[PDB]
Structures are given as structure tokens and as C-alpha cells.
Design an enzyme around this catalytic site. Structure first.
Site, PDB file in Angstrom:
ATOM      1  N   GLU A  10      69.866  65.709  81.248  1.00 47.28           N
ATOM      2  CA  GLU A  10      70.318  65.120  82.579  1.00 47.28           C
ATOM      3  C   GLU A  10      71.639  64.468  82.104  1.00 47.28           C
ATOM      4  OE1 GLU A  10      68.986  65.584  85.395  1.00 47.28           O
ATOM      5  OE2 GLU A  10      67.497  66.757  84.452  1.00 47.28           O
ATOM      6  N   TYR A  12      65.169  58.421  81.151  1.00 44.05           N
ATOM      7  CA  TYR A  12      66.018  58.284  82.431  1.00 44.05           C
ATOM      8  C   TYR A  12      67.218  57.351  82.224  1.00 44.05           C
ATOM      9  CZ  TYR A  12      62.319  60.540  85.322  1.00 44.05           C
ATOM     10  OH  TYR A  12      61.184  61.426  85.663  1.00 44.05           O
ATOM     11  N   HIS A  36      75.783  66.719  91.363  1.00 47.53           N
ATOM     12  CA  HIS A  36      74.954  66.586  89.936  1.00 47.53           C
ATOM     13  C   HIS A  36      74.144  67.937  89.559  1.00 47.53           C
ATOM     14  CE1 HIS A  36      71.369  64.680  87.788  1.00 47.53           C
ATOM     15  NE2 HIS A  36      70.864  65.788  88.030  1.00 47.53           N
ATOM     16  N   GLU A  37      73.515  68.565  90.698  1.00 47.36           N
ATOM     17  CA  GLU A  37      72.898  69.879  90.650  1.00 47.36           C
ATOM     18  C   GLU A  37      73.684  70.896  90.080  1.00 47.36           C
ATOM     19  OE1 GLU A  37      69.663  68.717  90.933  1.00 47.36           O
ATOM     20  OE2 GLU A  37      69.824  70.076  89.594  1.00 47.36           O
ATOM     21  N   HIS A  42      74.446  71.316  86.615  1.00 52.83           N
ATOM     22  CA  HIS A  42      73.447  72.012  85.993  1.00 52.83           C
ATOM     23  C   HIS A  42      73.606  73.665  85.944  1.00 52.83           C
ATOM     24  CE1 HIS A  42      70.743  68.930  84.680  1.00 52.83           C
ATOM     25  NE2 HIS A  42      70.510  68.514  86.071  1.00 52.83           N
TER      26      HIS A  42
HETATM   27 ZN   LIG Z   1      69.380  66.869  86.844  1.00 50.05          ZN
END
Ligand SMILES: [Zn+2]
Length: 654
Positions: free
Chosen positions: A479, A589, A450-451, A454
Site C-alpha cells: 500500500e 496500515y 490511489h487505485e 496500483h
Molecule cells: Zn491500495
């Protein structure tokens, strides 16, 4: 970027940066109408944002990673001074006047698309700050903003400073591990002290098989600061509503949502209502399963059975469902995910997907010896795209959660040349040692994937203005790209590329992979229905006039979740997001996650999860624009239509 700055240089650098930057604003702020031009006004502000951003990040980053406490403290202080400065400049009425004048002088459609967008954003930000309004309105806004800040500080502080605890005997704590026990403050009465802090709360509600103990703790945890915070919340609601009207909006939500992909409170309400309706049947199935487990357990332990799922039963039985219904041997799974292997496989997947090659810069300068610097280059031309650091292991003073920190924004310099983006990914995976391998849980592999997503967004974006660089997109969309990428850790092929038994070198058994992937759905209906309850309470408080927080939450819990709020409690009074900058955006979210599945299913699942052709379209349609294009437009181009909830529901088996 510089990483050898002392605490004193950070202090000095901060004052200098502020003075030099303020100088540009003063110059723009004192221009006569006649001298206002694109180059002297728009370009001047755009250019200083570039120089300022790079410097600011160098000064505020050390607080999160420097092994030196003196450097960390100076970095934290610089961050505060710089943040105050940022606000100060954004409220400059003299500068705003010149921006408004430029907008007047600029011929219609004369500017390049991103330049036009930049100008419009500057105009918009000033209006959202109320700079165009009458003095009396601005004075009231200023007065309300001050009260709101203080109220939010108190809401959070009240919760964080709370030291409520409940005394329990070893028997009353049945089900809790040995390590957990003993770690508690043994009272001179014999009973152990259990606090309401997360490290005590969650494991208790999930592991303690004593119902009365779960009940007492749930009641207490959801009743913290009930009186004081419920009062603050009522004031936050009223004040936010007044400020929003003064700024021209009928509700606070509408004011907040103007900058999000969702755009309006109506859009969000319809989104949440439709999602709740669609998930209802799954919720019914999951509650039927939990009620049966509770009946069976009460019978097994000789406990009374009230025939109802209580708030204090949720986490406990959801955990039981996961352990007894999905049966995933995590301890065995871990052995196939040594950090070295995950890192290698993960980088390999992103290379192929994006047409990149990562090159380790041996001996590069870094804030810590375990930090590694990599240069991302185009796989065919070798041309540099950007750079990124990996700081994966825990250490004293280092930021405790996984995250992506933008350091140098990818954008154009004053001379028109492009400067590459430089970002850093921070994680806290156990560092491998002598005879102690670092085996990652599947959730850590998920967070890692996930990170890094980014990081790739930061590096692959090609915006020309710093304001639109990298992850500077709508809050309810930022996100989405990473959540879309999480899908890779739930696919067999990608998982096999990131795994290998640390000792035997054997591949993860397909039987194990199957169960793992299946476990993704465990309690997903109730998990999501609860998130919807939270999102709806957040929307109600910021759209309704006099809605009672506790009552709204209770009503929603019964009608949507199917599990009653415990009488006498007030969960909203403990709902930190309401005073932590997420006001009116909690739905974000669910919004990003739902639409991220459309992105994944519609393109990658249909054309090839490891297909570089789809990967390049993703890079081009989603990452490359950065915030220079609206999320809705990027998605429309990537999907070939507007997004829908269809893929998300289908992934749930609906
Ligand atoms: Zn994130």
C-alpha cells in the site's frame, strides 16, 4: 485474455486448467534425483505459473464484473475450485523434495539473482507450510489449521449473521436526516428500528445529537457476539501460538512477520511505541478541543455535562470538529470535480510522472459497454509497456468498492520473451447522465488516484518471474506506493489539473483549495492513536500467552487514546481483522502510511512534485522490481537511506 466465455465454458475451462497444471506438478513430483535440473524443475514450475495465472484470472475475474449472474456464479465456483487446487499443490511433498534436491545440486551463486530469489522463496514457502518437518509435527499442524479455519469462519459469521436492533422514537433520533428516518422499520409501537449494521451505526454516532441514543448504540455495537466470539478468540490465540511453535517460531506474530518488511514482533512493537509517544501531544490538543465542544453543546442543549469524552462522543464531536473547525464546503467543491475532468487530469499526471502515453483502444472487447481499454506506451519510443481497463460506474452485480485487479502478469514467457501486464481498475463513481453531472467527493478523487497507482505498479514492474510480478511485494509495503501517491490530491498544482467547474469552466478558488488541504489534518491525532490501539491489541494477542482481549483493549484505550472503553463491552470480540487474514498484521496500515510519507517528502517534495526526473527514479526504484527485490532494499535505493517516521510526524505539524 478472453471476456466472451459463457458460464459453461468457465466450468469446462476450470477442469481443463486444473488437469493440465496438475500434470506439470506430477511430472516434477516424480522426477528421479538424477533427472532434477534447473530447466526440468525450477523453470518448469516457473513456466506453468505463468500459463496458470493468466487462465486463472480469466476464470475468477467475471465474478466481480460480469453483468450476467450465471457467469458470475460460475466464476465464483471456479475461484473456489482453483483456490483449493492452489493449496493442494502448495502442500505437495513429492514436488517439494525435488525443489530441495535442486537447491542441493545448484552450485553456489550459479543462478541469476531473480532465479535464486525464486528458488529460495519456493524453499521458504514449503518450510512455512511445514513440509520439511517430522510426520507427527505435520499432522498436528494440519489438525490445528483445520480448527483455526472453522473458528475464523464462525467468528465472522457470528458477526455478519447478527440481527441485533434497538427501538428509538423520532425524538430519541434527533439529528438524523429525513432520508435516513422513514427508511427504518417502523414498529407497531411507533418507535423506529435501528440495526447495528454500518449503514445505521456510523451515521447515527456522527449525526444524532441525543447522547443517550449514541450511548445505547455504541454499547450494543461493541458488545455483539461478546460471549461466543470472546471464547473463539481465546482459542484462536492459543491455537495460533501452538501452530507457530510447531513451525519453529516463539510467537504467531514472529511467524507472520517473517514475510513482511517489519520482519519481527520486536520491530513492530518499537514502531508502534515510538509513534504513540510522538503523537501524544497532538492527541492531548485534540481531546481538549473535543471536550470544549461537548461542554458548549451540553450547555446549549441543556444536557448534563460529565466533563469527560466517552466512547460514544468520539465520532460525533470529531465530525463537529471537521465541520465547525475546518469548514470545507464539500457541496461547492464537488462542482469542480466532474468525473470526466478528474479522469483526464489524473491520467495526465501519471503520464508525465512515469514517462508514459495512454492510448484508448476504440471498440476493444470488454465485459461491459462502459468499460474502456487503454494501452500504455513509452512516451519517446512508443513501445508498449502494458494495458489497463477502466470500469468506473456502478451496475447490478458489480464489485462494490474501488480496486485494481491484476489480470495478466508482466513476466517472461517460456521462450524468454516478455509478456506485458494487463490490469483492470474498478470503481463505482456515479455515471454522468443527461442533466445530472457526476461530481466526485474529494475522498473519491483520493481513492481514484490511489487505485490507479496500483495499476501503474502492475504495468511498470519488470519482474521476470510471475511470482514477483506487479504488486506481489511485502504485505506491509504493497500500500505504500499508492499512499505516497495520495499526496498528490492534497497539493494545489495536481488538484488544479484534475479540476474544472463542471458548468462555468472556472478554476477552483485558491481560498477553497487552501481550506481543503488544511482539512487533511482534522482529528488526525486521535484517528491515528486509535489505529495504534488496534495494532497493539493485534500484536498483544499474537505475542502474549494469556492476555485478556477486552482488558488489553481497555487499558490501551485509556493510556493511548485517552478515551475509555465502555464497561461491559468487548470490541476485540467484534474485531473482524483478527479472523480475516490480518492477524498480526494490523500495524501494516500505519506502517505503509508512515513510510509512504518519507517516500513523498524526501524525494518528490524536495525535487518537484511534478518533476519527471523524480518520477522516473520512482518508476525505476520502486515499481520496476515488483517483488524481485525486498522493500527495504528498494526504499534504501530510493531514499538513499532507511526510512524514518520523521516525515509523517512533520506532516502532522509535529
Ligand atoms: Zn491500495
Amino acid at each position: 485474455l478472453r471476456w466472451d466465455l459463457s458460464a459453461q465454458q468457465i466450468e469446462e475451462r476450470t477442469r481443463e486448467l486444473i488437469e493440465q497444471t496438475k500434470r506439470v506438478y506430477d511430472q516434477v513430483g516424480t522426477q528421479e534425483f538424477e533427472d532434477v535440473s534447473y530447466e526440468s524443475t525450477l523453470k518448469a514450475l516457473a513456466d506453468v505459473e505463468v500459463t496458470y495465472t493468466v487462465q486463472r484470472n480469466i476464470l475468477d475475474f467475471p465474478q466481480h464484473v460480469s453483468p450476467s449472474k450465471d457467469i458470475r456464479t460460475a466464476s465464483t465456483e471456479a475461484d473456489k475450485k482453483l483456490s483449493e487446487f492452489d493449496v493442494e499443490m502448495s502442500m505437495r511433498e513429492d514436488v517439494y523434495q525435488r525443489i530441495v534436491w535442486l537447491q542441493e545440486k545448484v552450485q553456489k551463486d550459479s543462478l541469476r539473482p531473480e532465479a535464486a530469489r525464486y528458488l529460495e522463496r519456493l524453499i521458504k514457502l514449503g518450510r512455512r507450510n511445514g513440509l520439511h518437518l517430522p510426520r507427527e509435527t505435520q499432522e498436528n499442524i494440519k489438525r490445528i489449521k483445520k480448527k483455526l479455519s472453522l473458528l475464523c469462519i464462525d467468528f465472522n459469521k457470528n458477526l455478519n449473521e447478527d440481527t441485533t436492533f434497538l427501538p428509538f422514537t423520532l425524538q430519541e433520533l434527533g439529528g438524523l436526516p429525513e432520508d435516513f428516518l422513514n427508511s427504518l422499520e417502523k414498529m407497531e409501537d411507533g418507535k423506529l428500528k435501528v440495526t447495528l449494521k454500518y449503514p445505521h451505526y456510523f451515521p447515527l454516532l456522527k449525526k444524532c445529537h441525543v447522547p443517550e441514543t449514541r450511548r445505547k448504540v455504541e454499547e450494543a455495537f461493541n458488545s455483539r457476539c461478546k460471549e461466543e466470539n470472546s471464547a473463539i478468540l481465546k482459542e484462536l490465540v492459543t491455537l495460533r501460538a501452538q501452530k507457530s511453535r510447531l513451525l519453529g517460531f516463539h510467537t504467531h506474530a514472529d511467524y507472520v512477520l517473517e514475510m513482511n518488511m517489519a520482519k519481527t514482533s520486536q520491530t513492530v512493537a518499537t514502531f508502534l511505541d515510538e509513534l504513540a509517544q510522538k503523537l501524544k501531544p497532538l492527541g492531548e490538543q485534540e481531546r481538549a478541543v473535543i471536550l470544549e465542544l461537548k461542554r458548549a453543546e451540553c450547555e446549549r442543549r441543556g444536557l448534563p455535562f460529565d466533563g469527560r469524552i466517552r466512547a460514544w462522543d468520539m465520532r460525533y464531536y470529531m465530525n463537529q470538529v471537521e465541520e465547525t473547525r475546518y469548514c470545507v464546503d464539500q457541496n461547492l467543491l464537488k462542482e469542480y470535480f466532474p468525473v470526466q475532468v478528474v479522469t483526464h487530469g489524473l491520467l495526465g499526471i501519471y503520464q508525465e510522472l512515469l514517462g508514459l502515453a495512454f492510448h484508448h483502444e476504440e471498440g476493444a472487447s470488454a465485459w461491459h459497454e462502459d468499460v474502456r481499454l487503454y494501452t500504455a506506451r513509452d512516451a519517446a519510443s512508443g513501445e508498449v509497456v502494458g494495458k489497463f481497463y477502466l470500469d468506473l460506474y456502478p451496475r447490478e452485480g458489480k464489485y462494490g468498492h474501488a480496486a485494481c485487479f491484476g489480470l495478466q502478469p508482466g513476466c517472461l514467457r517460456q521462450d524468454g520473451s516478455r509478456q506485458i501486464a494487463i490490469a483492470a481498475m474498478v470503481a463505482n463513481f456515479t455515471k454522468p447522465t443527461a442533466d445530472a453531472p457526476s461530481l466526485l467527493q474529494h475522498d473519491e478523487v483520493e481513492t481514484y488516484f490511489h487505485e490507479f497507482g496500483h495499476v501503474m505498479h502492475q504495468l511498470c514492474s519488470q519482474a521476470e518471474f510471475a511470482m514477483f510480478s506487479g504488486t506481489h511485494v511485502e504485505r506491509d509495503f504493497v500500500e505504500a506506493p499508492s499512499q505516497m501517491l495520495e499526496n498528490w490530491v492534497w497539493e494545489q498544482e495536481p488538484l488544479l489539473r484534475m479540476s474544472r467547474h463542471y458548468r462555468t469552466g472556472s478554476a477552483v478558488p485558491r481560498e477553497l483549495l487552501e481550506k481543503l488541504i488544511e482539512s487533511r489534518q482534522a482529528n488526525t491525532g486521535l484517528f491515528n492513536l486509535r489505529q495504534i490501539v488496534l495494532a497493539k491489541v493485534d500484536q498483544a494477542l499474537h505475542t502474549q500467552t494469556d492476555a485478556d482481549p477486552a482488558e488489553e483493549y481497555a487499558r490501551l484505550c485509556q493510556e493511548i487514546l485517552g478515551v475509555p472503553a465502555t464497561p461491559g463491552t468487548n470490541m476485540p470480540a467484534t474485531f473482524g481483522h483478527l479472523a480475516g487474514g490480518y492477524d498480526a498484521q494490523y500495524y501494516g496500515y500505519l506502517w505503509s502510511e508512515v513510510y509512504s510519507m518519507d517516500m513523498f517528502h524526501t524525494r518528490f517534495k524536495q525535487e518537484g512534485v511534478l518533476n519527471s526526473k523524480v518520477g522516473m527514479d520512482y518508476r525505476s526504484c520502486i515499481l520496476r522490481p515488483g517483488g524481485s527485490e525486498d522493500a527495504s532494499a528498494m526504499l534504501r535505493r530510493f531514499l538513499g537511506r532507511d526510512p524514518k517516521q520523521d516525515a509523517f510526524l512533520l506532516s502532522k505539524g509535529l
